[PDB]
């Protein structure tokens, strides 16, 4: 047998919370634009290794991250700094390139989403 790990933590009740213009942009513009993209659906929740029959996924990926987690974290004010959120997006993309062979469909989807992510981050407000 093999099991899914628990999904990443999405609330830190002991961490101070704030809403900033940049965090609002990350949620309402960056995450929203990627979420609605045609290639987003594999990235909208944690990789379900059981239902996808990938017993090696969490043997290889020890820092999983996904856009559903990022959305919940933003909604919970989990991030104090915009850079913490950006790091989670970066982790999500790099995990995909670690696990999957170059040229696989999922990798081309990640590369397209990453390009859009960088385009959105180019216009991060003050």
């Amino acid at each position: 047998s093999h099991m899914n790990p628990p999904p990443p933590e999405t609330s830190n009740p002991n961490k101070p919370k704030r809403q900033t213009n940049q965090l609002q942009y990350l949620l309402r513009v960056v995450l929203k634009t990627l979420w609605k993209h045609q290639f987003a659906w594999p990235f909208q929740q944690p990789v379900d290794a059981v239902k996808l029959n990938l017993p090696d996924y969490y043997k290889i990926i020890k820092t999983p991250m996904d856009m559903g987690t990022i959305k919940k974290r933003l909604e919970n004010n989990y991030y104090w700094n915009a850079q913490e959120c950006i790091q989670d997006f970066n982790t999500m993309f790099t995990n995909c390139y670690i696990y999957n062979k170059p040229g696989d469909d999922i990798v081309l989807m990640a590369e397209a989403l990453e390009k859009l992510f960088l385009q959105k981050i180019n216009e991060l407000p003050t």
Binding site: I60, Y99, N100, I106
Partner: peptide, 10 residues
């Protein structure tokens, strides 16, 4: 490094 996930409609 992994088994991979096959086709995704591309």
């Amino acid at each position: 490094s992994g088994r991979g996930x096959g086709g995704x409609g591309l």
